[model samples]
Target: HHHHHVNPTVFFDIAVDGEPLGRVSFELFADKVPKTAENFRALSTGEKGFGYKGSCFHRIIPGFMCQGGDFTRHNGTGGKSIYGEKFEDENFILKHTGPGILSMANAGPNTNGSQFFICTAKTKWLDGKHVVFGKVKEGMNIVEAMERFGSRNGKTSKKITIADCGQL
Candidate 1:
Protein backbone atom coordinates (compact mmCIF):
# COMPACT_ATOMS: atom_id res chain seq x y z
CA HIS A 1 0.00 0.00 0.00
CA HIS A 2 1.26 3.45 -0.89
CA HIS A 3 1.43 5.52 2.23
CA HIS A 4 0.13 9.02 2.23
CA HIS A 5 1.13 11.74 4.70
CA VAL A 6 -1.48 13.90 6.32
CA ASN A 7 -0.75 17.37 7.60
CA PRO A 8 -1.42 17.73 11.29
CA THR A 9 -2.95 20.80 12.88
CA VAL A 10 -0.25 22.90 14.57
CA PHE A 11 -0.45 25.16 17.60
CA PHE A 12 2.08 27.73 18.72
CA ASP A 13 2.26 28.56 22.40
CA ILE A 14 3.21 32.21 22.63
CA ALA A 15 4.72 34.02 25.57
CA VAL A 16 5.68 37.59 26.14
CA ASP A 17 8.97 37.89 27.98
CA GLY A 18 8.58 34.40 29.50
CA GLU A 19 4.95 34.91 30.54
CA PRO A 20 2.06 32.99 29.07
CA LEU A 21 0.23 34.89 26.38
CA GLY A 22 -1.89 32.20 24.70
CA ARG A 23 -1.98 29.61 21.99
CA VAL A 24 -2.38 30.35 18.31
CA SER A 25 -3.51 27.35 16.32
CA PHE A 26 -3.70 27.03 12.56
CA GLU A 27 -4.14 24.54 9.75
CA LEU A 28 -1.58 24.35 6.99
CA PHE A 29 -2.69 24.41 3.37
CA ALA A 30 -0.22 21.78 2.31
CA ASP A 31 -1.89 21.25 -1.03
CA LYS A 32 -1.82 24.91 -1.92
CA VAL A 33 1.44 26.03 -0.30
CA PRO A 34 3.30 22.78 0.02
CA LYS A 35 6.92 23.83 0.47
CA THR A 36 6.13 26.87 2.54
CA ALA A 37 3.84 24.91 4.82
CA GLU A 38 6.35 22.11 5.15
CA ASN A 39 9.05 24.52 6.26
CA PHE A 40 6.77 26.03 8.91
CA ARG A 41 5.55 22.66 10.21
CA ALA A 42 9.00 21.25 10.54
CA LEU A 43 10.25 24.29 12.42
CA SER A 44 7.18 24.58 14.63
CA THR A 45 7.14 20.94 15.73
CA GLY A 46 10.89 20.33 15.94
CA GLU A 47 10.41 17.45 13.54
CA LYS A 48 13.51 18.61 11.77
CA GLY A 49 15.28 18.52 15.19
CA PHE A 50 15.49 22.32 15.30
CA GLY A 51 12.28 24.06 16.33
CA TYR A 52 11.07 27.57 17.05
CA LYS A 53 11.03 26.94 20.79
CA GLY A 54 12.58 30.17 22.07
CA SER A 55 12.29 32.37 19.02
CA CYS A 56 10.87 35.83 19.46
CA PHE A 57 8.43 37.71 17.28
CA HIS A 58 11.19 40.10 16.25
CA ARG A 59 9.08 42.59 14.31
CA ILE A 60 5.68 43.84 15.45
CA ILE A 61 3.26 46.37 13.99
CA PRO A 62 0.25 47.40 16.00
CA GLY A 63 -2.12 47.63 13.04
CA PHE A 64 -0.23 45.51 10.57
CA MET A 65 1.42 42.24 11.58
CA CYS A 66 3.76 40.46 14.04
CA GLN A 67 6.78 38.94 12.34
CA GLY A 68 8.93 36.13 13.76
CA GLY A 69 10.30 32.64 13.18
CA ASP A 70 14.00 33.47 13.14
CA PHE A 71 14.81 30.45 15.27
CA THR A 72 18.55 30.91 15.07
CA ARG A 73 19.09 34.64 14.90
CA HIS A 74 15.96 35.91 16.73
CA ASN A 75 16.64 39.32 15.17
CA GLY A 76 14.95 38.84 11.78
CA THR A 77 18.33 38.39 10.10
CA GLY A 78 18.50 34.61 10.42
CA GLY A 79 16.29 31.52 9.95
CA LYS A 80 16.36 28.43 7.78
CA SER A 81 14.18 25.52 6.81
CA ILE A 82 14.79 21.80 7.09
CA TYR A 83 15.75 22.06 3.46
CA GLY A 84 18.57 24.45 4.43
CA GLU A 85 19.31 27.72 2.60
CA LYS A 86 16.47 29.66 0.91
CA PHE A 87 13.68 28.32 -1.25
CA GLU A 88 11.52 29.60 -4.08
CA ASP A 89 8.35 31.58 -3.54
CA GLU A 90 5.21 29.50 -3.43
CA ASN A 91 3.03 32.61 -3.85
CA PHE A 92 -0.23 30.77 -3.94
CA ILE A 93 -3.34 32.86 -4.47
CA LEU A 94 -4.41 34.07 -1.05
CA LYS A 95 -5.42 37.36 0.56
CA HIS A 96 -4.19 39.26 3.60
CA THR A 97 -7.80 40.13 4.12
CA GLY A 98 -7.96 40.21 7.94
CA PRO A 99 -6.47 39.44 11.28
CA GLY A 100 -4.93 36.08 12.20
CA ILE A 101 -3.68 35.31 8.73
CA LEU A 102 -0.24 33.62 8.65
CA SER A 103 2.24 34.30 5.85
CA MET A 104 5.86 33.64 5.08
CA ALA A 105 8.55 36.38 5.49
CA ASN A 106 11.09 36.57 2.75
CA ALA A 107 14.09 38.74 2.00
CA GLY A 108 13.21 39.16 -1.65
CA PRO A 109 11.62 36.95 -4.28
CA ASN A 110 11.76 33.19 -3.54
CA THR A 111 13.95 33.75 -0.46
CA ASN A 112 11.59 32.13 2.03
CA GLY A 113 13.26 30.25 4.85
CA SER A 114 11.95 30.37 8.42
CA GLN A 115 10.61 33.86 9.01
CA PHE A 116 6.83 34.45 9.17
CA PHE A 117 4.22 36.99 10.20
CA ILE A 118 0.69 37.13 11.57
CA CYS A 119 -1.69 39.74 10.26
CA THR A 120 -3.56 41.83 12.81
CA ALA A 121 -5.87 43.50 10.28
CA LYS A 122 -6.71 43.67 6.61
CA THR A 123 -3.41 44.27 4.77
CA LYS A 124 -4.52 44.09 1.16
CA TRP A 125 -1.34 45.80 -0.03
CA LEU A 126 0.51 42.54 0.73
CA ASP A 127 -1.87 40.41 -1.31
CA GLY A 128 0.54 38.97 -3.86
CA LYS A 129 3.84 39.76 -2.14
CA HIS A 130 3.65 37.06 0.53
CA VAL A 131 2.35 33.53 0.80
CA VAL A 132 -0.65 33.07 3.10
CA PHE A 133 -0.39 29.46 4.18
CA GLY A 134 -2.73 29.40 7.17
CA LYS A 135 -5.15 31.35 9.35
CA VAL A 136 -5.55 31.55 13.10
CA LYS A 137 -8.11 29.04 14.37
CA GLU A 138 -7.90 30.21 17.98
CA GLY A 139 -6.51 32.88 20.33
CA MET A 140 -6.80 35.93 18.10
CA ASN A 141 -7.13 38.12 21.14
CA ILE A 142 -3.57 37.26 22.01
CA VAL A 143 -2.58 38.29 18.53
CA GLU A 144 -4.31 41.62 18.95
CA ALA A 145 -2.47 41.96 22.21
CA MET A 146 0.77 41.66 20.28
CA GLU A 147 -0.41 44.37 17.95
CA ARG A 148 -0.98 46.78 20.80
CA PHE A 149 2.60 46.24 21.94
CA GLY A 150 3.89 47.20 18.51
CA SER A 151 5.05 50.70 17.66
CA ARG A 152 5.93 52.94 14.74
CA ASN A 153 7.89 51.50 11.82
CA GLY A 154 8.86 48.36 13.78
CA LYS A 155 9.53 50.29 16.94
CA THR A 156 8.25 48.49 20.03
CA SER A 157 8.88 48.23 23.72
CA LYS A 158 7.97 44.61 24.37
CA LYS A 159 9.25 41.20 23.47
CA ILE A 160 7.15 38.22 22.35
CA THR A 161 8.26 34.65 22.27
CA ILE A 162 7.14 31.33 20.90
CA ALA A 163 7.60 29.36 24.08
CA ASP A 164 6.74 26.12 22.40
CA CYS A 165 5.13 24.68 19.30
CA GLY A 166 3.76 21.28 18.46
CA GLN A 167 1.22 19.26 16.53
CA LEU A 168 -2.30 19.24 17.94
Candidate 2:
Protein backbone atom coordinates (compact mmCIF):
# COMPACT_ATOMS: atom_id res chain seq x y z
CA HIS A 1 0.00 0.00 0.00
CA HIS A 2 1.00 3.67 -0.51
CA HIS A 3 0.66 6.71 1.66
CA HIS A 4 -2.76 7.54 3.06
CA HIS A 5 -3.77 11.20 3.04
CA VAL A 6 -4.93 11.11 6.64
CA ASN A 7 -1.53 10.18 8.00
CA PRO A 8 0.80 12.94 9.15
CA THR A 9 3.56 13.76 6.68
CA VAL A 10 6.88 15.52 7.23
CA PHE A 11 9.76 16.92 5.21
CA PHE A 12 13.42 17.46 5.72
CA ASP A 13 15.41 19.95 3.68
CA ILE A 14 18.84 18.48 4.16
CA ALA A 15 22.39 19.46 3.20
CA VAL A 16 25.95 18.29 3.57
CA ASP A 17 28.10 20.90 5.23
CA GLY A 18 27.59 23.93 2.89
CA GLU A 19 26.09 22.13 -0.12
CA PRO A 20 22.30 22.37 -0.29
CA LEU A 21 21.32 18.73 -0.77
CA GLY A 22 17.55 18.65 -1.27
CA ARG A 23 14.24 17.87 0.42
CA VAL A 24 13.00 14.41 1.32
CA SER A 25 9.36 13.82 2.14
CA PHE A 26 8.18 11.08 4.48
CA GLU A 27 4.78 9.59 5.27
CA LEU A 28 4.50 8.30 8.81
CA PHE A 29 2.40 5.21 9.52
CA ALA A 30 0.65 7.05 12.29
CA ASP A 31 -2.38 4.83 12.18
CA LYS A 32 -0.30 1.77 12.93
CA VAL A 33 2.64 3.33 14.74
CA PRO A 34 0.85 6.13 16.51
CA LYS A 35 3.14 7.10 19.35
CA THR A 36 6.27 6.43 17.33
CA ALA A 37 4.96 8.42 14.41
CA GLU A 38 3.91 11.32 16.61
CA ASN A 39 7.34 11.31 18.17
CA PHE A 40 8.84 11.77 14.71
CA ARG A 41 6.28 14.35 13.71
CA ALA A 42 6.85 16.49 16.79
CA LEU A 43 10.59 16.07 16.49
CA SER A 44 10.50 17.21 12.89
CA THR A 45 8.45 20.28 13.81
CA GLY A 46 10.52 21.06 16.89
CA GLU A 47 7.40 21.44 19.03
CA LYS A 48 9.56 20.73 22.08
CA GLY A 49 11.97 23.60 21.23
CA PHE A 50 14.38 21.03 19.75
CA GLY A 51 14.09 18.86 16.66
CA TYR A 52 15.86 17.45 13.65
CA LYS A 53 16.18 20.83 11.92
CA GLY A 54 19.84 21.38 12.66
CA SER A 55 20.78 17.79 13.42
CA CYS A 56 23.28 15.87 11.34
CA PHE A 57 23.21 12.32 10.05
CA HIS A 58 25.86 10.71 12.22
CA ARG A 59 26.02 7.34 10.49
CA ILE A 60 25.93 6.34 6.84
CA ILE A 61 26.33 2.67 5.96
CA PRO A 62 26.83 2.99 2.21
CA GLY A 63 24.17 1.13 0.21
CA PHE A 64 22.56 0.21 3.50
CA MET A 65 20.98 2.97 5.60
CA CYS A 66 21.70 6.43 6.99
CA GLN A 67 20.99 7.29 10.66
CA GLY A 68 20.41 10.66 12.34
CA GLY A 69 17.96 12.69 14.46
CA ASP A 70 20.46 13.60 17.18
CA PHE A 71 19.60 17.31 17.39
CA THR A 72 22.00 18.55 20.06
CA ARG A 73 24.42 15.69 20.36
CA HIS A 74 25.60 16.11 16.71
CA ASN A 75 26.72 12.48 17.01
CA GLY A 76 25.06 9.09 17.61
CA THR A 77 25.25 9.26 21.42
CA GLY A 78 22.49 11.80 22.20
CA GLY A 79 18.78 12.39 21.52
CA LYS A 80 15.55 12.84 23.48
CA SER A 81 12.09 11.55 22.79
CA ILE A 82 9.36 14.17 22.62
CA TYR A 83 7.93 12.45 25.67
CA GLY A 84 11.25 12.21 27.46
CA GLU A 85 14.76 10.83 27.05
CA LYS A 86 13.39 7.44 25.91
CA PHE A 87 10.26 5.57 24.92
CA GLU A 88 9.17 2.01 24.28
CA ASP A 89 8.89 0.43 20.86
CA GLU A 90 5.35 1.01 19.66
CA ASN A 91 5.26 -2.20 17.54
CA PHE A 92 6.83 -3.84 14.51
CA ILE A 93 3.84 -4.15 12.21
CA LEU A 94 5.74 -2.30 9.50
CA LYS A 95 8.63 -4.17 7.99
CA HIS A 96 11.98 -2.75 6.90
CA THR A 97 11.26 -3.65 3.31
CA GLY A 98 13.03 -1.50 0.73
CA PRO A 99 14.89 1.72 0.33
CA GLY A 100 13.37 4.81 1.96
CA ILE A 101 11.76 3.01 4.89
CA LEU A 102 12.06 4.81 8.27
CA SER A 103 12.94 2.74 11.32
CA MET A 104 13.85 3.48 14.92
CA ALA A 105 17.46 3.00 15.94
CA ASN A 106 17.27 1.87 19.50
CA ALA A 107 19.70 0.40 22.01
CA GLY A 108 17.45 -2.65 22.21
CA PRO A 109 13.79 -3.57 22.34
CA ASN A 110 11.57 -0.70 23.52
CA THR A 111 14.46 1.73 23.83
CA ASN A 112 13.27 3.98 20.98
CA GLY A 113 13.95 7.64 21.23
CA SER A 114 14.77 10.33 18.66
CA GLN A 115 17.35 8.48 16.64
CA PHE A 116 16.12 7.04 13.33
CA PHE A 117 17.41 5.53 10.13
CA ILE A 118 16.37 5.52 6.46
CA CYS A 119 17.15 2.53 4.34
CA THR A 120 18.82 3.35 1.05
CA ALA A 121 18.47 -0.27 -0.03
CA LYS A 122 16.44 -3.34 0.81
CA THR A 123 17.41 -4.06 4.41
CA LYS A 124 15.66 -7.40 4.88
CA TRP A 125 17.60 -8.49 7.94
CA LEU A 126 16.20 -5.63 9.99
CA ASP A 127 12.69 -7.04 9.98
CA GLY A 128 11.22 -7.72 13.46
CA LYS A 129 14.12 -6.01 15.22
CA HIS A 130 13.49 -2.26 14.93
CA VAL A 131 10.19 -0.48 14.57
CA VAL A 132 9.47 0.80 11.07
CA PHE A 133 7.15 3.77 11.35
CA GLY A 134 7.51 5.64 8.04
CA LYS A 135 8.86 5.70 4.53
CA VAL A 136 10.11 8.25 2.06
CA LYS A 137 7.29 9.71 0.00
CA GLU A 138 9.75 11.26 -2.45
CA GLY A 139 13.31 12.44 -3.04
CA MET A 140 15.04 9.08 -2.81
CA ASN A 141 17.65 10.72 -5.02
CA ILE A 142 18.59 13.04 -2.23
CA VAL A 143 18.97 10.05 0.06
CA GLU A 144 21.13 8.39 -2.58
CA ALA A 145 23.14 11.56 -2.95
CA MET A 146 24.28 11.01 0.63
CA GLU A 147 26.19 7.79 -0.08
CA ARG A 148 28.81 9.87 -1.80
CA PHE A 149 30.10 10.62 1.68
CA GLY A 150 29.29 7.30 3.37
CA SER A 151 31.79 4.84 4.66
CA ARG A 152 31.84 1.10 5.26
CA ASN A 153 32.03 1.66 9.00
CA GLY A 154 28.94 3.91 8.89
CA LYS A 155 31.01 6.99 9.63
CA THR A 156 31.43 10.02 7.38
CA SER A 157 33.92 12.78 7.86
CA LYS A 158 31.37 14.99 6.13
CA LYS A 159 28.15 15.10 8.12
CA ILE A 160 24.75 15.55 6.48
CA THR A 161 22.52 18.12 8.12
CA ILE A 162 18.78 18.44 8.24
CA ALA A 163 18.96 22.09 7.24
CA ASP A 164 15.20 22.43 7.67
CA CYS A 165 12.30 20.17 8.66
CA GLY A 166 8.58 20.28 9.52
CA GLN A 167 5.18 18.86 8.79
CA LEU A 168 3.90 19.15 5.23
Scored by TM-score, the top model is 2
TM-score of each: 0.92, 0.94
Superposition TM-score, candidate 2 onto the true structure: 0.94
lDDT of 1 by residue, 11-116 (tens): 8888876888899888887878888888888888897689788889888988789999888888889998778779887875878889888998887788888899
Superposed by TM-score, candidate 2 places the C-alpha of residue 105 at a distance from the truth, in angstroms, of 0.3
- Scored against the true structure, residue 96 in model 2 reaches a CA lDDT of 81
Which residue pairs show backbone clashes in model 2?
Answer: none
Candidate 2, residues 55-136: lDDT per residue as tens digits? Answer: 8999998989999988768788888898876888778788988999999998987888899999988887888889999999
